[PDB]
């Protein structure tokens, strides 16, 4: 368990993955 970084990339192709801690996948974990 870790998350991705806030303005790290969360571009995996893994399906259903690119859990950003901040939420929201742009390739990079933004924010809303």
Same mark, same amino acid.
């Given at each position: *368990?870790? +998350?991705? $970084? &806030?303005?790290?990339? +969360?571009?995996? &192709?893994?399906? $259903?993955? /690119?859990?950003?801690?901040? /939420?929201?996948?742009?390739?990079?974990?933004? *924010?809303?």
């Amino acid at each position: *368990d870790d +998350c991705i $970084k &806030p303005y790290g990339f +969360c571009s995996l &192709p893994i399906l $259903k993955n /690119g859990l950003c801690c901040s /939420g929201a996948c742009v390739g990079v974990c933004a *924010d809303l």
